[PDB]
Amino acid sequence: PKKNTEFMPYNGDGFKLLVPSKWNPSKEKEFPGQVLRYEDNFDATSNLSVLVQPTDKKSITDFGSPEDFLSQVDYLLGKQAYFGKTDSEGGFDSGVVASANVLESSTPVVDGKQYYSITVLTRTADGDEGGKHQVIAATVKDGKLYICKAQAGDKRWFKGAKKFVESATSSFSVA
Ligand SMILES: [Cl-]
Ligand SMILES: [Mn+2]
Ligand SMILES: [Mn+2]
């Protein structure tokens, strides 16, 4: 087995995923239950995290649909200091980010385990700050909620970051 110069398989406790080879580990504690964080040091809005949290649920489906799940983890999307209505008349219409557009979601079953994935375009209060593309994949096993969230800014997304964000999240697998 030779080294891939683009994607790096990473094995953690109970999970594995592909991490971009040119990204580096981050010691920033961003979210509850964080066990991994990697970032593009030359654009830190490109980053990924793996979180492992306790949950009362048995399956990701116990949260409801992918859209329901997103509403229950919307702290992943932004750090707004208040719960607020967005200006959408449907879809994501309220939470802790100023604006969120759900682009797509999916419910892949892999090795007999139900995963959710959801892709969301966000903005904050100052629209002098660029929009972000955030992809969240998640599953539940053994009393734990496993989350992989990867993201990149709009411009970086269309200059190759898409591949890395979507690959990281879609590769995320729990034993
Ligand atoms: Cl965007
Ligand atoms: Mn708007
Ligand atoms: Mn965009």
From Swiss-Prot:
<dbReference type="GO" id="GO:0019898">
    <property type="term" value="C:extrinsic component of membrane"/>
</dbReference>
<dbReference type="GO" id="GO:0005509">
    <property type="term" value="F:calcium ion binding"/>
</dbReference>
<keyword id="KW-0793">Thylakoid</keyword>
<keyword id="KW-0809">Transit peptide</keyword>
<keyword id="KW-0472">Membrane</keyword>
<dbReference type="GO" id="GO:0030145">
    <property type="term" value="F:manganese ion binding"/>
</dbReference>
<keyword id="KW-0934">Plastid</keyword>
<protein>
    <recommendedName>
        <fullName>Oxygen-evolving enhancer protein 2, chloroplastic</fullName>
    </recommendedName>
</protein>
<dbReference type="GO" id="GO:0009535">
    <property type="term" value="C:chloroplast thylakoid membrane"/>
</dbReference>
<keyword id="KW-0604">Photosystem II</keyword>
<keyword id="KW-0602">Photosynthesis</keyword>
<comment type="function">
    <text>May be involved in the regulation of photosystem II.</text>
</comment>
<dbReference type="GO" id="GO:0009654">
    <property type="term" value="C:photosystem II oxygen evolving complex"/>
</dbReference>
<keyword id="KW-0150">Chloroplast</keyword>
<comment type="similarity">
    <text>Belongs to the PsbP family.</text>
</comment>
<dbReference type="GO" id="GO:0015979">
    <property type="term" value="P:photosynthesis"/>
</dbReference>
